[PDB]
């Protein structure tokens, strides 16, 4: 039962070669990138910024 | 085709080479030879006189005379042809020989057997197919090997060995691992001591050396002697620890001694078995084939001989004609239903009609189920309601016979008359003169509608998918499996269990719920199952549990492989365990739709290999044939197939036992037909029995060793009981019975006993549970048995009196015991025995829900033991104040005795809850096959299923205090 | 030899990945986010309650219109709700009662569902006759359908218990691509903003980034001590969060190829059933198996608030495309909208 273990172990090593052949980015820049995204869209997220009840379809009005 | 040389009787027996169609029928083949003989015969006159029926076709399979019984078998499947090709026998040889009529000895033997059974086995009146008869010819082969599988010496002596570990309390009563063997012999009573882990062979060898210089003969040798108990016949031989004998272990608890006596080997020839004549039926007897061979598709119409059941998509359809009751007992209407187990697969009623003694419909009902989706165990259930709606009759019919062929033609069936165990019966009313009759038609077919055998193949689904399921699903999967077997399974569970089938198979405790979901109404789903059960490594090695294997044998699981695996786990039990549940298994053959099975052949091979089992098996089946006519034909066929196996001696013993009972019932009933005249007439009647053939040596039914003898007429009396039992006091017939006492027996008429026999079986099962936990409560199971209808023999417990008599004679109870136990040491010992028994009976009855009774049914022994009687008629249980005063504590105070009362109960109560799986089955399975579901809940209501053990103590004691209240 | 040399080469490339990853681990997100103003307390109120389901709800999914939502339930029905009006636009009864997932198509025309029946049954809301007719039975999987998301009206990705995923073409009913590489049942998935990437969570306690275009595993993320129960992308598409039975959440950035943040608390001991981000992503909404749904600061990793509006396990939850409202389904047979 070597042809299966070998056929499997080859996929593994051919897969790990795929994943390791990537140019990663420094975490500091990875974070900065994500932090600066929220900073940009903080206004456009009513979950973050409570919006006026008038603009809320779920509080002000029953007719839609 | 094939060449076969057939041997004719004409001189030397003439033989000619013929050929037979490869795909023909057994029957056809016969005609082919008939003509050639009639043409090639030197003197055809003899053949002219007779026909093919007079002769039988025998072929020797390695010296074995086989008979090709079935005349509808495929010629190809004949093992002779298959065997010859393996032998390369060409041309094959088969002989033709005329039949012969039975001789008187054969008729005499058959007449002998029929009297024992209470029925006839050759009766062919109230049947409509050769099922019953096929089985009889079929059970021979197991019984020849089983008989060939017994050894002479051990079979006759039948030691009652055991292999359970010694309980703790007995271990106390074994000092220095030794015991005393009081070897009685003639007059020379020689006493010796021996270790508790030796064997009789060693003891006898040493005993002669000790006495090397008793009435022993000089010429003989130690080879010629074997031990035997005194006052009974229960030999002690076989390589085994002397601690491993249920007899030795019995004395140690009793605080008594062992009294052995030398003996001589009982003669093996005394158990000879009459030679056999019936030829060996075909091995390829139940063989049909696979779907490929039995399907029209892919075949030319010229060579079509059978149709696989799975090729037919026509909706099942049945034509009724009418009903006919000769006696006038309103609106009525038949309501047919396809049932499996207890499931109403489909249903189709008919229009209301006027109620005349005969009502005609001539209507076709059509069933959604499809002929390719018929599960082997179907049962067309037919009802005749009355009108708001009341059931009045019923009847059932298999929709596949015993040889894998659908039912076709006109059938007239005689109906019974009213869930229950008997409402699943596949036999027709023998009352063919005043019984409601139904006439139906099943459509014919130019070919038989066979049904092939499932062909398991490797299943890659169980190979790749490891089913390493998400923890959320694994939580829910194991959430239901924990529940008790009584718990219903909703479809979501059914789908959930079904999908993770190859994973839930790893838990042996989940089987009764894995197979409660399978969809039996669809062929493809069933096909998957036969490969699900193809893998059984987990089940094979799992622990042998008997509170679970019973679940498979229960009614719900009617398939042919679900029950097959259950038996294979019972094949590992041992004689001691078999006897414990033997009454449980026998009443569980009443749910099989077929007659032959693994369960039936299992009881056969066990009885033939053991004697004590054989004795008890015989008196259980006979208790049913006479009682329940619904299944009497099923029981009778097996019983006779067994009586041919056990040697002559047991037959003689069986005959003598039945003779005695026969006379008593007449005397009993005759006396009940109607002061001192009764005893005068009784004794007058009794002294006549001596003048009759009343045997002078007959083993008591409930004790293969304890024989009896003549009556002590002066001690044969009638008690002032409404049902007026007969009291009998025989005297032991054993010459060397050290002590001499009466073998009391009671004969109560007017109360059926099956309810009480089963209960006493239960209380004997519970004892084994506490034995493993090394406890005791001093229960007293007294041998009770049933023999007819409302008639049965009971064992009498010496030195006992009903409490009510003492009551009519709370302090009253205290004085009676002290008078019976004047000595304080014995009096205190009696209280100790009174605490154990009072607690144990209170605990056990509560589990079974019959504790609430009257003091009359409760009787107190002289030795301090207490126990109940007459639990056949039916507060948590009885704890009357008089017990409390005897406990040494009055009101609510406490003493060392009272604390033991409450401590022992707690130990016992929590001991049983470990085996609630075993009790939930036994209890209600009895309720089903016992008296003629809400009532069941008492097993699950107060037994505290799935709760903290501490709360069970609280909840349990919440009843004792209430009983005290 | 041949298998051991490949095993020893394998176990060297792994530490090259750990070393290639440890190199970028210059600072943690907790350091960088120390300065940013904390998110505060997200005091949320139950605006709507969606009654009508008879048993446990297994899945729900917002439509691209941010008003409609489907819900699959143990009671075997697939209901379409009008979140704004609470009215049931459709009450579709199902063939298999063991539905486990649902996914409103982005176009709004199709809805899909599936479960232990091993089929992804596609339903049409806008039918010829105005009926609710089944367009397709995407069959072929050898395990229960665990989750699925529409790429379009004609394409849909589904995950299953076969330890593999697959891309389907709805018209042909054929597995376009098969995503092998996982070693366990795939509990959840999430498509990247670009339809060319999607993540998937499995019981093997690992995540894998797939290229929808090709069908290969690009990166493999670890860190969870238990099954991954839920997974979703960071709004931009460069990070994603995973829910597990180990009572912890984790954030992963695609570019950094490692864990950035853990969202957990000593009190939190039960597994995570579901996750969702707010429109901006500053908020991570985690469902829990204690009837609660705690609100974490995605940057600070501090629990800003708690949604406790369910009587049974909070099985599923979602966020609208506009982040205007949050639905949360549960085993109590009720969904709840929040604002």
């Amino acid at each position: 039962n070597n042809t299966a273990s070998i056929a499997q172990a080859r996929k593994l090593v051919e897969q790990l070669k795929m994943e390791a052949n990537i140019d990663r980015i420094k975490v500091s820049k990875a974070a900065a990138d994500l932090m600066a995204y929220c900073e940009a869209h903080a206004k456009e997220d009513p979950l973050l910024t409570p919006v006026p009840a008038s603009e809320n379809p779920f509080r002000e009005k029953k007719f839609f | 085709l094939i060449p076969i040389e057939f041997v004719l009787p004409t001189s030397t027996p003439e033989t000619a080479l013929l050929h037979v169609a490869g795909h023909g029928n057994v029957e056809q083949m016969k005609a082919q030879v008939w003509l050639r003989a009639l043409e090639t015969s030197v003197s055809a006159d003899f053949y002219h006189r007779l026909g093919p029926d007079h002769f039988l076709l025998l072929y020797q399979k390695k010296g074995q005379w086989y008979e090709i019984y079935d005349k509808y078998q495929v010629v190809q499947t004949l093992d002779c042809l298959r065997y010859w090709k393996v032998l390369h026998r060409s041309p094959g040889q088969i002989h033709v020989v005329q039949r012969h009529a039975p001789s008187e000895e054969t008729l005499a033997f058959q007449r002998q057997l029929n009297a024992l059974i209470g029925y006839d086995v050759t009766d062919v009146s109230n049947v409509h197919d050769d099922e019953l008869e096929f089985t009889r010819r079929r059970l021979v082969t197991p019984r020849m090997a089983e008989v060939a599988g017994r050894d002479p010496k051990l079979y006759a002596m039948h030691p009652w060995v055991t292999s359970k570990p010694l309980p703790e309390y007995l271990l106390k009563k074994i000092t220095n691992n030794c015991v005393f063997i009081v070897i009685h012999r003639s007059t020379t009573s020689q006493t010796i001591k021996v270790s508790a882990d030796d064997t009789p062979g060693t003891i006898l060898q040493s005993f002669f050396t000790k006495m090397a210089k008793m009435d022993i003969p000089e010429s003989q040798n130690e080879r010629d002697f074997v031990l035997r108990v005194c006052g009974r016949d229960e030999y002690l031989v076989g390589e085994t620890p002397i601690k491993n004998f249920q007899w030795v272990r019995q004395c140690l608890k009793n605080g008594e001694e062992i009294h052995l006596v030398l003996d001589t080997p009982p003669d093996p020839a005394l158990d000879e078995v009459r030679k056999e004549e019936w030829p060996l039926v075909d091995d390829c007897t139940g063989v049909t084939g696979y779907h490929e061979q039995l399907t029209i598709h892919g075949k030319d119409h010229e060579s079509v001989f059978t149709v696989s059941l799975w090729d037919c998509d026509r909706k099942f359809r049945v034509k009724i004609r009418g009903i006919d009751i000769p006696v006038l007992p309103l609106t009525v209407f038949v309501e047919a239903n396809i049932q499996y187990g207890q499931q109403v697969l489909c249903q189709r009623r008919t229009s209301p009609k006027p109620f005349t003694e005969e009502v005609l419909w001539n209507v076709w009902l059509e069933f959604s189920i499809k002929i390719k989706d018929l599960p082997k165990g179907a049962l067309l259930n037919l009802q005749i309601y009355c009108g708001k709606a009341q059931l009045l009759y019923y009847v059932n019919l298999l929709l596949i016979d015993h040889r894998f062929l659908l039912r076709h033609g006109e059938y007239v069936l005689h109906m019974w008359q009213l869930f229950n165990a008997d409402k699943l019966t596949s036999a027709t009313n023998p009352d063919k003169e005043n019984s409601m009759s139904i006439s139906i038609l099943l459509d014919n077919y130019c070919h038989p509608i066979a049904l092939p055998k499932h062909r398991p193949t490797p299943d890659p689904e169980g190979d790749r998918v490891r089913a390493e399921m998400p923890n959320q699903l694994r939580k829910q999967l194991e959430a239901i499996i924990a529940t008790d077997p009584l718990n219903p399974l909703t479809a979501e569970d059914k789908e959930l269990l079904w999908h993770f089938r190859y994973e839930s198979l790893k838990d042996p405790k989940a089987y009764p719920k894995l197979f409660s979901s399978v969809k039996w109404g669809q062929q493809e789903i069933v096909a998957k199952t036969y490969q699900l059960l193809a893998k059984r490594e987990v089940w094979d090695q799992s622990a042998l549990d008997v509170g679970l294997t019973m679940q498979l044998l229960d009614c719900n699981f009617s398939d042919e492989n679900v029950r097959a695996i259950a038996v294979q786990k019972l094949e590992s039990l041992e004689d001691d365990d078999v006897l414990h549940y033997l009454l449980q298994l026998v009443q569980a053959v009443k749910f099989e739709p077929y007659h032959d099975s693994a369960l039936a052949r299992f009881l056969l091979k066990r009885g033939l290999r053991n004697k004590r089992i054989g004795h008890f098996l015989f008196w259980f089946l006979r208790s049913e044939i006479a009682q329940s006519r619904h299944y009497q034909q099923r029981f009778a066929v097996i019983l006779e197939a067994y009586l041919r196996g056990c040697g002559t001696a047991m037959l003689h013993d069986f005959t003598q036992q039945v003779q005695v009972i026969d006379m008593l019932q007449k005397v009993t009933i005759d006396i009940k037909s109607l002061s001192s005249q009764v005893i005068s007439q009784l004794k007058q009647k009794l002294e006549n029995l001596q003048n009759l053939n009343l045997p002078q040596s007959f083993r008591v039914p409930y004790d293969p060793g304890l024989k009896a003898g003549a009556l002590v007429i002066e001690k044969c009396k009638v008690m002032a009981s409404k049902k007026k039992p007969l009291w009998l006091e025989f005297k032991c017939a054993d010459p060397t019975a050290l002590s001499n006492e009466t073998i009391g027996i009671i004969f109560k008429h007017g109360d059926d006993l099956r309810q009480d026999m089963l209960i006493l079986q239960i209380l004997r099962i519970m004892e084994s549970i506490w034995e493993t936990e090394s406890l005791d409560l001093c229960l007293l199971p007294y041998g009770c048995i049933s023999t007819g209808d409302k008639i049965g023999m009971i064992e009498i417990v010496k030195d006992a009196t009903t409490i009510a008599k003492i009551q009519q004679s709370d302090e009253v109870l205290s004085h009676w015991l002290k008078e019976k136990c004047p000595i304080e040491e014995k009096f205190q010992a009696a209280v100790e025995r009174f605490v154990y028994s009072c607690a144990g009976y209170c605990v056990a009855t509560f589990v079974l829900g019959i504790g609430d009774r009257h003091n009359d049914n409760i009787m107190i022994s002289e030795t301090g033991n207490l126990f109940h009687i007459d639990f056949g008629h039916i507060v948590p249980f009885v704890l009357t104040p008089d017990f409390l005063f005897v406990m040494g504590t009055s009101g609510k105070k406490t003493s060392l005795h009272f604390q033991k009362f409450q401590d022992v109960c707690v130990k016992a109560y929590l001991a049983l809850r470990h085996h609630t799986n075993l009790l939930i089955i036994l209890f209600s399975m009895m309720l089903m096959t016992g008296m003629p579901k809400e009532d069941i809940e008492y097993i699950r209501d107060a037994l505290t299923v799935g709760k903290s053990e501490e709360d069970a103590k609280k909840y349990f004691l919440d009843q004792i205090e209430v009983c005290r209240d | 030899s041949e298998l051991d040399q490949l095993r020893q080469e394998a176990e060297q490339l792994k530490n090259q990945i750990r070393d290639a990853r440890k190199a970028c681990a210059d600072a943690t997100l907790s350091q960088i986010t120390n300065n940013i103003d904390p998110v505060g307390r997200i005091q949320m109120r139950t605006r709507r309650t969606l009654r009508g389901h008879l048993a446990k709800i297994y899945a729900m999914h917002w439509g691209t219109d941010s008003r409609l939502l489907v819900s699959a339930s143990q009671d075997g029905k697939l209901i379409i709700w009008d979140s704004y009006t609470t009215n049931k636009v459709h009450a579709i009864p199902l063939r298999s009662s063991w539905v486990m997932t649902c996914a409103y198509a982005p176009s709004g025309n199709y809805v899909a569902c599936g479960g232990l029946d091993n089929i992804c049954s596609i339903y049409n809301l806008k039918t010829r006759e105005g009926n609710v007719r089944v367009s397709r039975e995407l069959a072929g999987h050898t395990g229960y359908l665990s989750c699925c998301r529409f790429l379009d009206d004609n394409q849909i990705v589904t995950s299953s218990g076969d330890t593999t995923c697959a891309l389907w073409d709805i018209e042909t009913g054929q597995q376009t691509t098969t995503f092998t590489g996982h070693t366990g049942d795939v509990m959840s998935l999430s498509l990247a903003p670009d339809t060319r990437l999607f993540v998937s969570g499995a019981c093997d306690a690992s995540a894998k980034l797939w290229d929808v275009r090709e069908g290969m595993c690009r990166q493999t993320f670890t860190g969870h001590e238990s099954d991954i129960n839920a997974i979703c992308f960071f709004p931009n598409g460069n990070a994603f969060a995973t829910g597990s039975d180990d009572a912890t959440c984790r954030l992963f950035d695609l570019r950094a190829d490692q864990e950035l943040m853990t969202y957990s608390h000593d009190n939190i001991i039960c597994g995570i059933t579901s996750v969702s981000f707010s429109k901006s992503g500053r908020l991570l909404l985690a469902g829990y198996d204690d009837f609660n749904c705690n609100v974490w600061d995605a940057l600070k990793a501090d629990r800003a608030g708690v949604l406790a509006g369910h009587d049974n396990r909070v099985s599923c939850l979602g966020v609208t495309d506009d982040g205007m409202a949050v639905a949360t389904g549960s085993w109590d047979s009720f969904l709840k909208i929040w604002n």
Binding site: - | I296, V307, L360, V412, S439, C446 | -
Partner: protein, 492 residues
């Protein structure tokens, strides 16, 4: 197309008097129609094979059987017979008789594959007695009629059929023309061979047809059915060249298919004012199975019973002392003008027949050539004991009137096979019995009685009746016992 719709439309109308005539006529106009309708049937036949309905199998079996007998030629490429074999071959899993119809039909289809048109040549060769040494067969059609009661139009029909219009020389032309056309189809120029055969003499017409019939049957006797077509086609080449007409074949330019109709068989009309059948006996003056005698008897209630006893006598007389029956095989055909009961069972016979050359005459010929399923009614056998104490057997169907002191013994049956006697002798006035099982009408009681034993007193003579009969009467009876009991009647 309109033709397909009309052919399909006509099919549905019939299967929902002379409707069957319309369908057969509408398909004979064009050779193509035959290959059109057959397909629509197989679609219907394979539908019931799926839906499994029972009411609509026998009608569809005969329509397929008739059309294949009337099909000119099957294209060598077309294989509509193989499609037919598949649909019917999956009926063996059906109840009897639904599997009875098909198993014979499957045998019929396989013969067509071997020797196409073999079915048509067998029928006509015996319908006109054009037998031969190898092929020996015959058939005779006879009309027994009562001019007093029967309508005039039928007599005209009887006269029309009795005319031996066709001549044996003409018959060979039709048979030989049809045989070659079927094998070769439109390829052959029928007009060219038609002229050739007209010249050749009857003796050589007999020779060619006999060998052709032998070749047609022999090909059906060859194992394979596909190449047998070529093998049979090969022999047809030899006969044409030996006889000298090979040009019409081998025609690269095909000829045309002509719808040859079914020739009328031989018929002989007779008057049947007599209620007996002695007239049949008279004619016999001037193989048992190779010849069949189809006798058609018209319908009238008053004629019925007497026909039954007359029919029974023929069964008695013959079955006991067979004279006519031995020579040939009998087939009777009642014609309402009994039928009530025959209707109740088969709605086909009710509509086609009971619903009642010219169309009416044309439809009748369809009924007699295809109806092949007898239907037998139950009759009562009773024996009368005269004052002399003898025994005379009598058979009655409808009723029985008899007749004051008298001995009556009767028993009541039940479907369950259990019988219960009832012996209540009682003086009465008269005894009447109607066939509702008989019904004992005592005078004023009435009960369905199964077995009855009527015993007189002191050998007292009395008169008895039989189904209200006024001709066959026995009197001076003392006792009688009544209990319920080739030349089959024919229905569909």
């Amino acid at each position: 197309t309109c033709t397909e719709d009309r052919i399909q439309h006509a099919l549905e109308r019939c299967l929902h008097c002379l409707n069957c005539w319309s369908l057969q006529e509408l398909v004979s106009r064009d050779p193509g129609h035959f290959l059109i309708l057959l397909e629509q049937i197989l679609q219907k036949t394979r539908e019931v094979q799926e839906k499994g309905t029972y009411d609509l199998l026998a009608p569809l079996a005969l329509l397929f059987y008739s059309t294949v007998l009337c099909t000119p030629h099957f294209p060598p490429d077309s294989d509509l017979l193989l499609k037919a074999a598949r649909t019917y071959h999956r009926f063996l899993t059906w109840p009897v008789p639904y599997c009875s119809i098909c198993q014979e039909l499957l045998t019929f289809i396989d013969a067509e594959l071997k020797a196409p048109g073999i079915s048509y040549q067998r029928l006509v060769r015996a319908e006109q007695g054009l037998s031969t040494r190898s092929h020996r067969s015959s058939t005779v059609t006879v009309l027994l009629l009562n001019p007093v009661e029967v309508q005039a139009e039928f007599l005209d029909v009887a006269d029309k059929l009795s005319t031996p219009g066709p001549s044996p020389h003409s018959a060979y032309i039709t048979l030989l023309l049809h045989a070659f056309q079927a094998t070769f189809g439109a390829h052959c120029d029928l007009s060219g061979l038609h002229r050739r055969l007209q010249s050749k003499t009857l003796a050589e017409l007999e020779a060619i047809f006999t060998e052709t019939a032998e070749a047609q049957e022999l090909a059906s006797g060859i194992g394979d059915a596909a190449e047998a077509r070529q093998w049979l086609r090969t022999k047809l080449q030899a006969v044409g060249e030996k006889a000298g007409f090979p040009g019409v074949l081998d025609t690269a330019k095909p000829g045309k298919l002509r719808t040859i109709p079914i020739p009328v068989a031989r018929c002989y009309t007779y008057s049947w004012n007599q209620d007996s059948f002695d007239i049949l006996q008279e004619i016999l003056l001037k193989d048992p199975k190779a010849s069949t005698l189809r006798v058609v008897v018209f319908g009238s209630d008053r004629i019925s019973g007497k026909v039954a006893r007359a029919y029974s006598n023929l069964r008695r007389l013959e079955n006991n002392r067979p004279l006519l029956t031995r020579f040939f095989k009998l087939q009777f055909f009642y014609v309402p003008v009994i039928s009530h009961y025959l209707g109740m069972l088969d709605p086909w016979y009710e509509r086609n027949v009971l619903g009642l050359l010219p169309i009416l005459a044309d439809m009748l010929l369809y009924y007699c050539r295809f109806a092949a399923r007898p239907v037998l009614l139950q009759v009562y056998q009773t024996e009368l004991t005269f004052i002399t104490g003898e025994k005379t057997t009598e058979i009655f169907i409808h009723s029985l009137e008899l007749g004051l002191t008298l001995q009556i013994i009767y028993s009541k049956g039940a479907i369950s096979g259990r019988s219960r006697w009832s012996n209540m002798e009682k003086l009465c006035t008269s005894v009447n019995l109607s066939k509702a099982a008989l019904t004992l009408n005592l005078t004023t009681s009435q009960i369905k009685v199964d077995k009855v034993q009527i015993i007189g007193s002191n050998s007292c003579p009395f008169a008895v009746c039989l189904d209200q009969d006024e001709r066959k009467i026995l009197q001076s009876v003392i006792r009688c016992e009544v209990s319920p009991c080739c030349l089959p009647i024919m229905t569909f």
